[PDB]
Structure formats: C-alpha cells, structure tokens
Design an enzyme around this catalytic site. Structure first.
Site, PDB file in Angstrom:
ATOM      1  N   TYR A 164       3.111  31.067 -15.816  1.00  0.00           N
ATOM      2  CA  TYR A 164       3.209  29.961 -14.863  1.00  0.00           C
ATOM      3  C   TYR A 164       3.238  28.560 -15.468  1.00  0.00           C
ATOM      4  O   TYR A 164       3.891  27.658 -14.922  1.00  0.00           O
ATOM      5  CB  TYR A 164       2.140  30.075 -13.775  1.00  0.00           C
ATOM      6  CG  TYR A 164       2.435  31.165 -12.755  1.00  0.00           C
ATOM      7  CD1 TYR A 164       2.698  32.489 -13.154  1.00  0.00           C
ATOM      8  CD2 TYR A 164       2.445  30.882 -11.397  1.00  0.00           C
ATOM      9  CE1 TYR A 164       2.965  33.487 -12.219  1.00  0.00           C
ATOM     10  CE2 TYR A 164       2.705  31.874 -10.458  1.00  0.00           C
ATOM     11  CZ  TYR A 164       2.961  33.166 -10.872  1.00  0.00           C
ATOM     12  OH  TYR A 164       3.217  34.129  -9.930  1.00  0.00           O
TER      13      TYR A 164
ATOM     14  N   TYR B 148     -14.186 -21.316   6.518  1.00  0.00           N
ATOM     15  CA  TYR B 148     -15.113 -20.487   5.739  1.00  0.00           C
ATOM     16  C   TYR B 148     -14.982 -20.725   4.239  1.00  0.00           C
ATOM     17  O   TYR B 148     -13.881 -20.942   3.728  1.00  0.00           O
ATOM     18  CB  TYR B 148     -14.972 -18.990   6.068  1.00  0.00           C
ATOM     19  CG  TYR B 148     -15.608 -18.061   5.038  1.00  0.00           C
ATOM     20  CD1 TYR B 148     -16.978 -17.757   5.085  1.00  0.00           C
ATOM     21  CD2 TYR B 148     -14.839 -17.492   4.010  1.00  0.00           C
ATOM     22  CE1 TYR B 148     -17.558 -16.914   4.140  1.00  0.00           C
ATOM     23  CE2 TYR B 148     -15.409 -16.645   3.058  1.00  0.00           C
ATOM     24  CZ  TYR B 148     -16.764 -16.355   3.129  1.00  0.00           C
ATOM     25  OH  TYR B 148     -17.325 -15.515   2.194  1.00  0.00           O
TER      26      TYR B 148
ATOM     27  N   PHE C 248      -8.985  -9.824  -0.128  1.00  0.00           N
ATOM     28  CA  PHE C 248      -9.724  -9.441  -1.330  1.00  0.00           C
ATOM     29  C   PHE C 248     -10.263  -8.004  -1.324  1.00  0.00           C
ATOM     30  O   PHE C 248     -10.848  -7.580  -2.314  1.00  0.00           O
ATOM     31  CB  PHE C 248     -10.834 -10.447  -1.693  1.00  0.00           C
ATOM     32  CG  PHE C 248     -11.590 -11.014  -0.504  1.00  0.00           C
ATOM     33  CD1 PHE C 248     -11.909 -10.227   0.598  1.00  0.00           C
ATOM     34  CD2 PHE C 248     -12.016 -12.339  -0.516  1.00  0.00           C
ATOM     35  CE1 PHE C 248     -12.601 -10.760   1.681  1.00  0.00           C
ATOM     36  CE2 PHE C 248     -12.717 -12.878   0.562  1.00  0.00           C
ATOM     37  CZ  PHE C 248     -13.007 -12.082   1.659  1.00  0.00           C
TER      38      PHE C 248
END
Lengths: 626, 624, 626
Positions: free
Chosen positions: A293, A70, A342
């Site tokens: 907090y 390919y 990829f």
C-alpha cells in the site's frame, strides 16, 4: 496542477530581489521565506502613503475632540502603559530572528491598507530596521493570538520606542539595548500617538509569520515526497500501473489525479521499470502480483494531503495580506469600526490541519522505508540495505531504520490539535482565542521531523540505486561464469540452459555472502537442476563443474563489486537526485569499507533540504512536466 | 455564498422523491441523507446497464477462457464475516452503504453482474438490510468486514441476520425469499467488487457532512439571535472589517449577520442601553460575539470543502482491480483506500469542536450577570431566587458537552498501524474517524438545543425587562407628583428608574439595600442639598414609604400577566414562535412545572429530525 | 508524609558532595539532578570492582576458547551503524552527563561484562566535564537508547566524527577530548558495544531530572495554595481534617494537613473572617473550586508524582542491557531489560498530572485577576490609582492562558504511538525518551506558571496591606470630620459603617467622585439620617462634612499610599516567599510609577525557581511542619 503552483513558489523564492510592500501587490509565502532566509532580499515600501497619512490624521484629530473610540480614548500615555503591561514574556528559547523579521514584515504590510492609523514614519522605521538586520529578542511564549500576538509584538513596539529592557540583535552577533540599536541605524525612539500602541501590538503577525515559512516548507516538502514516490517505485521494483490515469479518473480527487499524473510521467520510460518487468516474468507465479500500500495507494494517500497544504497556503496568504488590528479605521466614511480582525483563527485551525497532513506524509515515508529495509518486502534487496558481502560486520542502515520509527512516532504525537485547548482568557474577555502561534510552532516542529525523515529516505534510496545496479552486474557475472564453465566441462544443452535459468532467477543478495556455500540458494538451485538433468538424461563433468565454480565464481564476483566501489540511473528521471547526493554531496555506497557513519552521510542530505539546495535536483528532475 | 449552497442542500434533502442512480448524475450528501432518513425516498437504477454488462462479460470471459488476471468468491466472504456484536452500524448507515456500493458499480469499472445491482436496488426499496458489527474496518482495501455483511445477505448466508423495516429480523435466505430474490452464486471478481470499497466510511461521512452543513448554518444564524439577547453591537459584522481580512467564510458569515441584524428591534434596545451611563459600560462586546465571523471562517471553509471531498468519493468507482474492458486490461491500484474521507473526517471533527467552543463561550456569557448586560444570573426569572436556579443545570451540562467534544476532536488518522501481514502498511481508518465526527455532531446538537432554549428564555426576560422598567417609571413618576416633589427631584428620580437594571432588585423591589432604593436614596439626599426644607423632607419620606404601597404589586402584576413586543419585529421570530408555540413551551420559572429536560428534549428532537430547518428557512427568507 | 519525603529530596540535592557508585547504594533522582546541575559534585566509583572483573573475564574466557554465545561472541561495526543521528537541537550536556552516570551505575551490578577500565574512564569523563554532543532524536528506547548511547561509545573509542564538549564552550573531536583528560581510545572487547549502547540510560536520565523537578514544583504548588487562600480571602475550613478523613486518598489527607498548618495562625485569615462578617448576606458563603477543592485536586497529582519517582529510581538502579551475564552459573541470559516501558508510561502519566497542576494555577490566577471573584482586589491587581494608564498584570494573565493551553496539549500520551520498528523485531517499543522530553517541556511551562503566580500573589499581599491601611485612613478622616462638623451619633455611626464596608479599590481612583461607591454610600446614609432624626441645621453640617471631605480625604489616602510605596505578612507563614521576592530579588509593588516591566520581575522569580534558590524560602516556610 498544484505541481506547477509549487515550482512557481520555488522559482519566486529563489528569484525575488525586493519585496514590494505597497498595499496592493500580494505578498506570498515565498516572499516571506525569502526575506527571512536570504539577507540580500530587501523591503521596498512604496509611497499607499496618501491613505496612510489620511488614516493617521483622522485618528489623531478624533482623539483631540474626545471621540469615543476603543483603544484610543478607551481602556483595554494610554499607549505606552499598554506596551509596559505587555512586556511580559520570560526567557527560559525565544522566537528566532527569522520569525521576528517575518513578523515585522507582516506588521508593516498590514499598515499599508490604511486602516490602522499608524504614522507613515513608523512604517519607515520598520522598513529600515528590516533592511539593516535589526530585530528585537522575543520570548517564545505568551500569545494566544486573539487580541493579536500581543506579548511578542510588544517587543517590536518596545524596540521602536527605545525601552532599555528590550535587547536587539544587529546581524548574527551584535546584541545591544534597544536605544543603542536605534542610534546605530540613525533612528530616535518614537513617542507613540493615538492608537499607535494598539496598532503595533494587536495583529496576527507572529502566528502568520511562523505559518508562512511553515507553508512554504510544507509545499516544497510535499512536492519532494510525491516525487520521491517515483524513485521508491524504481528501487523497490514496483508496478507503475498504480498511477494509470484511468484509476484516478474514476475517483477524481484533484490531488489524487495530479499526484498520479506526476508519477505516471516520472516512470514512463524508466529503465528501472524495465528491470522490474523482467524480475516479475522470472518465477512469475511465486512473487506478489501487486505492490504493497505504501506505493500502490500513494496517490489516494497523497490526495487529501495535497489539498490540505494548498488550501492552507491560500488561507495564510489571505492573512498575510490583511489589515488585522482593531478598530478598523473607515476614514472615507468618518467612523471607527469595532471588530476582531486580530483573531487568528483562520491560521490557527489550518495549522492544526496541516500538522495532521504532515504526519500523514511522515507515515507514508515510514511505511516506504520499512519495506525497503526488509528482505521479504524489498524484492531482492538485502536486509537493511547491507552490502556486506560480510554481513557479520555490516548492519547497513539499521540505525536509520530505528530512527525512522522514532521520527514517525514523535510526529504522530505532535499532530494532535492545539485549537481544542481554548481557555477562557483575559478576565473572560477573550473567551474564544485561536492559539494560532502555538499551533504554528507545533506544525513547524512537525516539519523539522519530516525533513529528517526525507533526508533518511533519500539516502536509503540512493543506497538502493547502487545495490540494484550492483545486482544487475553481479547477476551477469554469475550468468557468464556458469555459461563458460558449462562449456569447459562439456555439459549437455539440457544441463546448460537449466543452470543458466538458475543463475538468472536466484536473488543474488541471498548468496553474496558466500557464493559457493552449498547451503545458500545458488548452489541449492544448481544442485536441484543437476539432479533433474541426470534423471532426464538417464556425472564426472557435473562434479568438475561444482569444483571449477569455487575457482572462478567468488573471485569474479568480488572483482566486479570492487570495481563498482571505486548504468540504469543515467536513464532515470531521478538521476539529478542521485548525482546530487553522490557527486555534489560527496558520498558513496554504504559498506564496512566506507568509513563515514550514517550520521555524516544523512547530515549532508538533511542540510541540503534545510537550506534549499535540494530544490535544484528537484527542479531538474521535473523539467518538461506540463 | 455558502449560505445559499446549504439552503440548496436542505431543500434537495426535503424535496427529492427518487434518487437517480445512473453513472452520470451526481449523488449529493442530501440525497444520501434523504435515502437514509425518509423511507418514501426510493432508488431508481436507470437502464448505464450497457457498460455494466460489457464489463461483466469481459471478466466472465477471461474466466471461461481461463486467462490468469489477479483480482473462491465465498471463501473471501467467509474469511471477512469476522465482526463481533458487542453495538452495530445502524440501518441508516447500512442502507447508505448499500446505495454507495450500488452507485460505485454504475461506472462499469467493477465487473459485477447487472442483476446484483438490481438486487441492491430491490433490497434498498424493500427496507431490507443486514445487521453489521460496528468495528473491524481500517478502510484500506476498503471497509472489508462491514461490506462482507451486505455480500453475505446477497448469497444468503444463514448466520447473517437481516432487518426488514423496524420490527422484523430474519436470517438472510428468508429475507431474500420475502422479496422475491434467490441467493446469488458469485462469479469472477464479484466477491472483491462487493467487499473492497469505501462505501461504509463514505456512508457515515455523508450523513455527517449533511448534518455538519445544517448545524453550521444554524450556529451561524444563532450568533445573530445571541447579539440580540446579549445587547451586542451589530457593528462587528460590518462588511468593511471583513473586506480587509477577506477569508471567504469570514466575509460570508459576517454578510449573513449584518443582514439578520439590520433592522433589529433588539438592536434598538441595545443602543438605548449603551446610551444610558454610556461611559460606565463596555465599549465593545466580548470575543464570543465580536469575533464570531473570524472564528466561523475556517469552520465554514472546512465543512464546505469536506462536503466536496465526500461527494467525489460518493461518485467514484472504489474497488480493485479497475476493469478497463475497452483496452482489455485489469488495472491494479487502490481506490479502496479511504484516505480522502479519513483525513477530512479528522478536520471536520476539529471544526465541530470549534463550533462547540463558540456555543459554550456564548452560553457562559449569558448565564453570568457581570457579562449579560442586565440579564439575571442563570437566566433565573424568580423573583424569588432562593427557589429558582434557572438554567444552572443546563450551564453545567454545556461544560460537560464542550469538554467531551474537545476530547473527541483528537485525530484518528495519526494512529495508522501496519496491518494485514504488513500489506496495508498505510490505511485510512476512515470509518473510525467518521464515527467519531458523528459522535461529535451528536454533542453539538445537544449544545445547539441548549443554546436556542436559553436564548428563548432571554427573549422573554428582555421583553419582561422593558415592561418592568416602564411600570417602575410610571410608579415613580406618578408618586412624585402626588407627594408634591419639585421637577428637579422628579426627573432625578426618574433617571434612576430608567438606569438601574431591573433584575438587580426584582426579588424585593422596596428593599432599602437593593439597587433601586439605593439609587433613590442618593437622589433624595442630592435634592435636599440642591434646594436648601422641613416640608421637602416630609414629602420625600412620604414618597419612600409609599413606594411599598404600590410598586411591588404592579411589578408582580405585569409579570404574572406576561407569564399567562420586540420579537415580532425580529428575524428570529420564527425560531421563538417554533420553540414557544409549536413545541409548546414558556418562560422558565419555579411556577412552570416542566423540567429543563422536558423543554430541551423538544428542541433537541426537532434538531434531530430536521423540523428545525422550517424556522431556519423562514428566518433566512429573502437573503441573497 | 510525602511532604517530608520531598523535603528529604531537596536536602539531598543541596548537601550531596559525592555520588557513591558501588552497586548497592541507591542513586536517587536528587543525586542525578545534583550531578547534572552542580559541577562540584563528583562521582566516586568505589572498589564492586571484583564482580565487574569476574564478569569481564568470563566474557573474555568464552572469547578465548571460542564458545559460541549469542550476544557475546564486531563492536566498532555496531557503533558505526548506530551513529545515525542528525543535528537539526541536541540532548543537553546535563542530560548526556546524567546518561553517563546511569550507564556507569548499571554496570556496577556485574551483569554486563564490561571492563572495569571502561568504567573508570566514564567516572573520569564525568568528573572532567567531558561529554559527547548527542543528537536529540532517534531513540525508541526499546533495544535501548541505541543511537544516543552510541555517541558515548563513540567518545570512548575515539571516533573522530564524534564531537565532544569540555565544559561550556570547548568542542573538540573525541581523540583530542580523551587526550585532554589523560585517557586513550578503547578497543572494545566482546559484548562491550552492547553493554554501552543497549540500555535505558538516556530516557531514565531525562526522567530523573524530570522527577526531581516534578517533586519540587508539586510541593511548591501545594504550599502556594495557602498563599492563595491568604490573598484571596478564602475560608481555611476547606482544609479541615474531618473533610478528608471521610475521603481518605493519601494525597488529599496530606495536602490538606499541610494547608491547615500553613493557615492556622494566619493574620490574613483574620482579615478574611472580618471581611465576611461585614455584609455577610451579600458575599459568597464558600470559596470557588480552585481553592476549596485544591486538596481533592492535588490528591491524584501527589500520588502520581511519588509513584513515578519510585519507578524512575528502580530504573536508575538497574542492569538494563542484554544479554544478562550470569557468570556464576556459566550462562548468558537473553531477555529485554533495555525495554524502557516502566519509564515511558509513567512519563505519560506525570505529564497529565503536571497539566493538572498548571490548570490549578491557571484557575487560581484567573480568580485573582477579576474583581468579581477576588473579594476586594482591583481588576488585574492594578494599583493605579489612575486605572486608565495602569493595566496591571493583564499581560501575565494573557500569558497564563497561553501557558495552560500549550501545557494541556503537551499532556497527550506518547506511548499510544508505538510503531512496529527495526524490521518488525521491535514490534513493541517504549518511546521513553520521547515521552520524558515532552514531560520536561511540560515542566518548563509549569515553571513559567509558578513564577507568574508567585509574582501575582506578592502583588496581592501588597494590595491587601495597602487596603487595610487605606480603610483605616478613610475611617479616621470620616470619624474626625464627623466631629468637626458636630454630626449626631446616629449620623457618625452610619457614616463610619460605610467607611468600613465599601471596598476601597472601587473608589481609590477618585475617592470623592459622587458616582463612585464611597460617596454613593455616604449620600445614602445621609438621607437615612435626615429621615431618622426628623433639620435645616443638620443639612448644613452634612454639606460642610461633604465639602471638607473633598478637601482632605484624598490627600490623606495619597500620603499613606505614597508612604507604602517608598504588617500582616510579618505574621504569615509565607513571609519567607514575600521577603524572598521583594528584598532578595529586589522588586516592589507593581504600578505605573515602578519602571521595571512585568518581564523583569517575573524573570527574577523564574530564574530562582529554575536554579533552585526558591527552595530556601520554601524550606523556611515549612520549618516546624512534621
């Protein structure tokens, strides 16, 4: 401890001279950022050459015999038609030189594993282009990071083959067509051989490049935020007991244990905690027994953020040190392997997580800054950290406060995910795609905002240092004056002690504007005690006291403040920061008598965070922590 | 491998008979889920009773001595019974919260009396739980409001309604009475110890994480089944590809897939398919299969890491103050801040959306003839397609599911309001986030149910395809001889029989405009050219007309016979046997009365109730 | 129709020379964009002057007799604390100058108490191209765009630290800039600080240019749906008035009305009708949703963009500071017109509608790239003929997924992220500027998508015109060759049917390849005719037909194509677009033989969209529509 790990990254970023690219030695996010940000850092490609030429030969020879591989003998001159179709970005805005050079580095590195089939000579040109500051101008958008960062990586390939339409930078100013740029570095355009186009364009190098500088910044800004929680405790009059190791031992998230350990250690012998303890022993039952907090739950809050940024670092490094094209050439076993390295999903998903973590760091900063600006929540500090003493013309850090809301709001918006937006792409071939580069850019944007918020917070805290020290010396003046005047006017030892308690207990910033104003808390507390003393001893001397108070008090208060504008920090672990911002950056306590705008002051802090200088006071501050 | 950890999770979930609550033995998400889902699972609180009573005494004496330490009991509970029934947290979640609350106390940091712990144990084993409003918690000083309902039960508040099993609802004091308990009168620090924890968010997040592991492994496994049915190239899972990009989740998922596909009889069919007209078919698979390991990588890692985080929370003391009785001090911190769970709930919801998108992309490919390598559109059997729209309804629904799922995966933790008189100026929103991740897992279950159904349909269609091409080959082969056609012609004709995808002409095999007759017509003309005659034409016209004597009837016969094999050699046999035999289904068609709903409901329910783990463990037998 | 209204907007943008600022004449978004983008456009402040001074003097009267009025009875300390931005990125000169216009205009209602002389200085700075450099972030747009507007005030009072631009390069400190244009620094009077800083001018400026672009691009996208119908072989019936009459959303009726008109006499709809009459039963009876449901899709988008336009204009033409000076009744009124919520919420909505526009474009572009969905067109619109080295618009296809994905991500709301700001005083705040900025970024992407889409459709016109020409060549070659070989009428008519029926792009790469659809269809018919007419003689002639075909046919397909490279669009309402892109911008059919990259072609289209030129062929295309 992640703390040691992050100091490791900073040391490496500063000390590295050459980046070894050899197919074995791991490149770290520090190395990527160092190449990107320090032009003295050079790439050294070490002749892995054997395996590169073996792969290159195999691919070339197979192509001859018509092997059916390919992107070699298959659809997606076959190589350059692929570059042409991918030169398809638009300049609207462009990927920065730092990202392009980082990407060139990562691409070069991916080839060294000998899986790609690229020619050794191409790698040599990449190395040379990097060390000579030549990089293509690259469009910002176009990648879905799935068959790789195809479009933006095509500009690097386009440079390498001398496409006249690709513009290259050479250093900061020179911009010439690509063939002109290769000429100037002693290179000729490559003619691409089998698989070379695909090898160049089909990698994760762009997303991973942005992700690397993102992650180095996230590690550094993380440690900076954690550290500055300690400074916040000091100026807000916190209770260091929130960082007690047993609290965290029984809820042992590793990031919760480690941040609390840093904080316990940072505050152990704090002279500010001394002041805090005293403040809470005066009017003991009329003040909060616990912190709010934003401080008290900081280690619990920091924990998932530490772990996110650390794990995401590992992931991006794995990507950095990977062969990420396709096919993967297995030359040793005479086969080409068809996969999808990829696909940038490891990076894509972790970029989404890191953006949420960065937003969480921003919200911690916002909440802390908000407390600091409000007199009901700052335990004695004046509103907006305004010195005045004339408040009618000193709105203090109000503008910075409004900006902190703007920063946080935009940051929370940015932290929505990119990876949920996958489209079925490329004739439905790419029906999953990572969008990693897009996510990495959004996370980078989020870090830009976090840096702004850190700059503002550090500035406000430096302002708070001055205000706390000024407070300590101002109270001593009031205590002295009340004491000596009580002597002069010949008041009883009942009245004296009662008036001195008041001097010690009233928060000075409530009456700094006009100390002898009968409606403000000093004279109210004094009037109360004067009445109490009368009934308890049941006058002339008292009324003379009040008169002699508007003789001495105000003038002696001004005198001390004036002195200060022209100490406990010296004994604090945060001295390096204070010294850095006040001495090295040339700033001072903010007031109507200081000409410089908030912009000028915070710009200096921001620039120092942006360029790395902030890491010096940070490293100093943490000296000895183990 | 994470694969073995998840199997261990499933085994432990199935096996456990008693949950050991002792302050030392970790409770896992499998235990929480087993307590929630299997009522024969019982809690066994082990008399840690020593350190519990020490702590309790320390607090109870600092009250009799009238010391002053910050952190009346009923007034805290009264102000927190502030929810509204619009919807409610389910009994499974409430019972899970009770367990986590019970567990939190075992470390001896909380100061609650041991007898209250005994009372929690008894209520859990008796299936008594309060009815709890769905919303109200920001998960910061804990899940205050919802935990207030458990404390409300313990003190027998008449307005708190309690379940006893599935059918009985009674006021709190009557529920206590029915289990031999009397209302508690709360002591120093006990109100705070009951209400100020992370137990509800952590309860939801436990069943969410257990489910996330199981569905993850299921989706990973079914990528192999997808490969088999789509005619994939198994080479995407080759260990070397993944060794050079070594994300642990990429290696480990590829590892499982290589193994699932190694001796596959469908992979054998795939190879023969790409050998025929080789250079006119795709060289590589589309991304939904080929990049599945790369896609799975961050999802595996996120779901595994979140499991660690949630289990740490399950095994924590998470109220305040923390009592250090040994050193005579009450420690003021904020272990009730659910941020560890909250943040990871956002992350897992994103990973779940990513799993959903993987499923949607795979299902999409399977429905479209252009992308399914020989399969009919919508996986429609027909043969009459005008009255068989196959799985089109399920296809549309998969888009519906993915779309809502991606919407759900926006973060909750970015929406922090400055709350409770600006005291809670940061708060985790863990329970809210966990609820959304749970909702996201509900949709993923729908998508899995649909995807597995469609793949069983595809298995049938692939098996039917192979048998139909064989009939065609035999009919062409024998007719060729009987018409006295030369060997040139016969073989040319047989190639066409082999090469033309059967689903392109199944509808009307002898239709002269459809691909079988088209291929034979071009082959007949090439034969006339290659051999030149009037006789050859006679026999070729005879061959063509005699095609509609036999072909259709024999294709229909072998079909009807199939309606009333490669999967037997496939690792996915257990899945197919489970869906077809055990659930009682069959190849979908206009001749089968069951709706897609009826078929998919059966699969969905098996996923929901954990029965699907049986074929899953079977399939993975021997994997190391 | 909204079409006429948008055409009015474009005409105004083009033909305006002076903007009348008088406090009665409405400023439209076209006027704002005209001012920002066309420097020849001047502000004309028309003496309105009388009320300004009345208001001014009222405020100054109270300052004289010492009245005490909150918000009016100092300024430089307000400006100082608000110069609190940081340069990381900046609000562009175009935004800043638009903000200056809107602030100027707000004063013309006589409600602000600002001096007329300050107004005249604004006009003068505007007409002389002076603007402050303004940091990008800091506004929550609630007590106004306080921080960014402070930089305008900082210019007016000559703060040295305030850097001003003059034109495109010149950057000077503020005193120098004022001196270069014949002004002197102001000393601000009572209420003038507030007048200047406490308004909505920045968010509404970005929002004005945002709305002008939204209107233009909307109409463009609507119009190009017709072009899409032409090149894709759609059925124009989807636009038929009765469909929309029975579902009468105003935007559905009007979009379809436009489309019916664009397609009524289309020469492409003629090729389309002919196309569906050949093999009618094998080809789809309805178009896919990106075309067939485009009116239903566009409906809410049209309506959002138009209502949002109204809202933004209402805000342009408002007094938006506080307190509101009601001099007539001797009172200052205390409210919050500086709360930018009208613009903030509508920016969120327009961003979603823009995302919906992008998705429409993405789905159209997708169909166009895929041969299965494009009714004859080659995959990727590749001309070839050699497709192994011509991947066509595959890069642009990938880019479109990237564009759409980031766009959908941007369309999350900003207004859901309201923090409790400024000591909890601004416990609701609009975040308008932040939202406007994100909608602007969304429009940047939409521009990219439109550029690509129009480029793809011009490619498709070319392929369609070549297709008609190619099929004619094939028919002629087959018709003449049948005669030369003395084929029967039966044979000749079968062979000519195949020539007309087979999509030419399936065999163009090798017209005489026996495995490609032309020869396949020819072989099939040849067998059918041998049977129907049943001989050795016929076979002789059919073989000679075949051998003569592979001598002549390809040469004549190449010739007609090579000629085309060196007609129905002429009758099409889209001729102006096609002519604009091919001739005006100088482009051509895309292929391996054309040197310019997809980048170079799309850049040209995008630049014309970005700078307004695209409105010429748009207005030409729509001539006659009423």
């Amino acid at each position: 401890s992640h703390v040691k790990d992050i100091l490791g990254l900073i040391n490496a970023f500063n000390e590295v001279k050459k980046i070894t690219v050899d197919g074995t030695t791991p490149i770290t996010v520090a190395h990527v950022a160092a190449l990107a940000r320090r032009h003295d850092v050079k790439v050294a490609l070490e002749a892995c050459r054997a395996r590169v030429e073996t792969c290159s030969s195999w691919v070339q020879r197979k192509a001859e015999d018509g092997a059916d591989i390919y992107g070699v003998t298959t659809g997606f001159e076959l190589q350059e038609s692929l570059i042409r179709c991918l030169l398809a970005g638009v300049f609207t805005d462009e990927l920065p030189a730092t990202a392009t050079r980082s990407a060139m580095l990562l691409r070069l590195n991916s080839f060294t594993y000998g899986c790609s089939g690229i020619r050794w000579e191409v790698m040599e040109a990449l190395e040379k282009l990097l060390n000579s500051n030549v990089s293509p101008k690259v469009p910002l958008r176009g990648s879905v990071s799935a068959s790789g960062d195809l479009i933006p990586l095509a500009y690097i390939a386009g440079l390498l083959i001398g496409k006249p339409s690709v513009i290259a930078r050479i250093g900061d100013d020179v911009e010439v067509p690509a063939p002109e740029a290769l000429s100037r570095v002693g290179l000729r355009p490559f003619k691409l051989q089998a698989k070379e186009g695909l090898a160049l364009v089909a990698g994760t190098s762009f997303a991973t490049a942005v992700a690397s500088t993102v992650m180095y910044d996230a590690n550094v800004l993380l440690l900076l935020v954690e550290t500055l929680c300690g400074m916040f405790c000091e100026v807000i009059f916190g209770r260091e007991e929130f960082a007690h190791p047993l609290i965290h031992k029984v809820k042992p998230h590793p990031g919760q244990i480690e941040s609390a350990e840093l904080l316990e250690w940072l505050l152990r012998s704090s002279p500010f905690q001394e002041l805090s303890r005293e403040y809470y022993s005066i009017d003991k039952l009329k003040k909060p027994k616990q912190d709010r907090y934003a401080l008290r739950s900081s280690p619990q809050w920091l924990a998932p953020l530490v772990q996110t940024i650390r794990d995401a670092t590992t992931t991006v490094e794995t990507e950095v040190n990977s062969a990420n094209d396709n096919p993967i050439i297995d030359h040793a076993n005479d086969r080409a392997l068809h996969g999808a390295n990829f696909q940038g999903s490891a990076v894509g998903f972790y970029m989404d997580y890191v953006r949420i973590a960065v937003a969480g760091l921003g919200k911690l900063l916002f909440a802390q800054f908000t407390e600091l600006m409000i007199e009901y929540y700052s335990n004695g500090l004046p509103g907006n950290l305004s010195l005045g003493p004339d408040l009618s013309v000193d709105y203090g850090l109000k503008g910075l406060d409004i900006a902190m809301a703007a920063y946080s709001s935009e940051l929370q918006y940015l932290a929505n995910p990119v990876t949920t937006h996958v489209h079925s792409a490329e004739q439905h071939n790419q029906d999953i795609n990572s969008l990693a580069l897009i996510s990495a850019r959004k996370t980078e944007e989020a870090l830009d905002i976090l840096k702004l918020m850190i700059a503002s917070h550090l500035t406000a805290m430096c302002q708070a240092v001055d205000l706390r020290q000024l407070e300590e010396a101002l109270v001593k003046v009031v205590e002295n004056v009340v004491s000596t005047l009580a002597d002069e006017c010949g008041l009883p030892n009942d009245t004296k002690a009662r008036l001195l308690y008041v001097a010690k207990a009233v928060p000075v910033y409530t009456y700094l504007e006009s100390p002898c104003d009968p409606t403000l808390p000093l004279l109210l507390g004094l009037k109360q005690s004067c009445f109490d003393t009368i009934l308890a001893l049941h006058v002339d001397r008292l009324a003379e006291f009040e008169k002699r108070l508007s003789d001495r008090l105000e003038n002696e208060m001004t005198a001390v403040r004036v002195l200060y504008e022209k100490v406990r920090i010296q004994g604090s672990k945060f001295l390096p920061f204070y010294r850095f911002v006040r001495e090295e950056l040339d700033t001072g306590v903010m007031s109507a008598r200081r000409e410089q705008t908030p912009q000028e002051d915070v710009q200096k802090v921001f620039d120092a965070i942006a360029d790395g200088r902030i890491t010096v006071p940070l490293l100093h501050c943490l000296q000895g922590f183990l």
